[PDB]
Amino acid sequence: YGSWEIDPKDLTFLKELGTGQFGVVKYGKWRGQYDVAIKMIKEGSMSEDEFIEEAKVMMNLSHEKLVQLYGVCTKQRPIFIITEYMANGCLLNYLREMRHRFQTQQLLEMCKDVCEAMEYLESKQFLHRDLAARNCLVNDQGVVKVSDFGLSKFPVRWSPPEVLMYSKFSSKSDIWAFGVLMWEIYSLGKMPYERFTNSETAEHIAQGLRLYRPHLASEKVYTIMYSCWHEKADERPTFKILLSNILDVMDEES
Ligand SMILES: Nc1nccn2c([C@@H]3CC[C@H]4COC(=O)N4C3)nc(-c3ccc(C(=O)Nc4cc(C(F)(F)F)ccn4)cc3)c12
Numbered sequence: 001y002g003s004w005e006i007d008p009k010d011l012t013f014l015k016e017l018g019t020g021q022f023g024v025v026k027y028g029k030w031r032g033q034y035d036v037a038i039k040m041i042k043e044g045s046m047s048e049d050e051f052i053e054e055a056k057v058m059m060n061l062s063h064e065k066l067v068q069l070y071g072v073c074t075k076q077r078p079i080f081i082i083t084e085y086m087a088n089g090c091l092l093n094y095l096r097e098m099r100h101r102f103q104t105q106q107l108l109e110m111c112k113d114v115c116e117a118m119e120y121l122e123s124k125q126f127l128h129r130d131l132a133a134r135n136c137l138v139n140d141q142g143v144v145k146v147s148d149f150g151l152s153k154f155p156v157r158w159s160p161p162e163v164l165m166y167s168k169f170s171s172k173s174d175i176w177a178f179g180v181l182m183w184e185i186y187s188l189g190k191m192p193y194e195r196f197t198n199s200e201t202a203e204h205i206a207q208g209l210r211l212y213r214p215h216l217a218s219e220k221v222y223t224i225m226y227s228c229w230h231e232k233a234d235e236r237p238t239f240k241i242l243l244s245n246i247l248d249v250m251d252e253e254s
Pocket residue numbers: 017018019020025037038039041054055058067081082083084085086087088089090093137147148149151
């Protein structure tokens with residue numbers, strides 16, 4: 001993989017962070033100085049050679065609000081993925097930690113960070129295909145970044161009606177999921193439609209049921225997340241519009 005190939009001799013493992021979706025993740029250093037996360041691609045977990053379109057995606061996409069790939073160690077097994085280190089870990093766990101006592105301006109900033117990454121992915125005509133708080137990470141400064149981008153159990157509770165009924169994926173199904181991710185942020189990590197199963201959620205969504213306004217979301221913030229859930233996909237905003245709406249609310253409320 002040319003310049004993306006990292007020499008595993010340059011890595012030093014400092015602590016196991018936990019079992020990531022797809023293998024063990026560890027905090028470590030590159031050439032003793034740079035902080036990195038090291039994902040060990042689990043042995044025979046998914047397909048490899050042909051499935052390495054995910055590395056082509058990680059190697060061609062780059063944004064300040066996307067978790068950055070630094071390199072790979074593929075001349076060995078298990079394969080290592082070296083990425084930017086996100087000290088506060090997964091957004092969903094970060095939201096659930098009641099000790100942060102978040103103010104609403106901090107929650108809207110988390111939405112803006114994700115919206116910026118998504119406007120960038122929209123501009124490259126790329127679909128995340130699993131946008132949710134579980135796939136976002138938080139760095140030491142509280143900056144949220146989107147990870148596992150377009151990786152590749154179906155995320156029923158983040159899907160619009162046309163996806164659940166017809167597998168109609170579009171930029172608008174990522175808009176819908178983003179509205180659900182804003183709801184996860186403003187509810188401090190509640191499971192969307194927490195009283196329902198996936199099957200009950202799909203039928204209620206087809207019937208026009210929508211997630212309620214979380215207590216911490218103002219009417220203006222709620223209007224932004226609710227605009228992502230229009231039944232007609234063409235009536236949902238673009239990520240550029242959502243970003244301008246979020247910036248307007250931050251200037252007004254803050
Ligand atoms: N960069 C990270 N920093 C800190 C913590 N991190 C965790 C924690 C694991 C334990 C759970 C538990 O608690 C918590 O906070 N969690 C988060 N995962 C990642 C992380 C590291 C690397 C990747 C990664 O390699 N992504 C990738 C890989 C592919 C590829 F190549 F394999 F196809 C394609 C697309 N994306 C993903 C997440 C990171």
